[PDB]
Design a binder for these strands. Sequence first.
DNA 1: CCTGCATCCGTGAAACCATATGGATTATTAAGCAAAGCTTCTTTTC
Length: 105
Amino acid sequence: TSDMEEDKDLMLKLLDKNGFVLKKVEIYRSNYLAILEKRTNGIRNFEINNNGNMRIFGYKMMEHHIQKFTDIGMSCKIAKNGNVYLDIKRSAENIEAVITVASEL
DNA sequence: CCTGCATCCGTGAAACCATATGGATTATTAAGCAAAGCTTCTTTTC
């Protein structure tokens, strides 16, 4: 969707803004991937699904980071190896909120 | 030397340095996978 395009525009705007460099930005399963450079704060990528949900996924994230993203109301799915899903709705205010909580981790 | 007594031994009721090193542990990614979801063909209903 073009809303996913514009939310990609503000996403790269606020990740490029806040000094969080990217490994690669990928359209994969027709979904966006704002992948972090290193596994910083136990986080892998800042992805966008086309199903109205931008998602933050990681590997062995600390609990207090997860609490900081449930401050802005995000779902989580831990795995058996430390893989953690973080669901939020894809919107510009959620772009600003997720990248401003990620910008203070 | 060999007969004759004694006994006695068995026997059961500290700290460190240094240097590899590899094996153990952790992260990271490709594969795959079950589950879901289009696309058309029959099947059942009025």
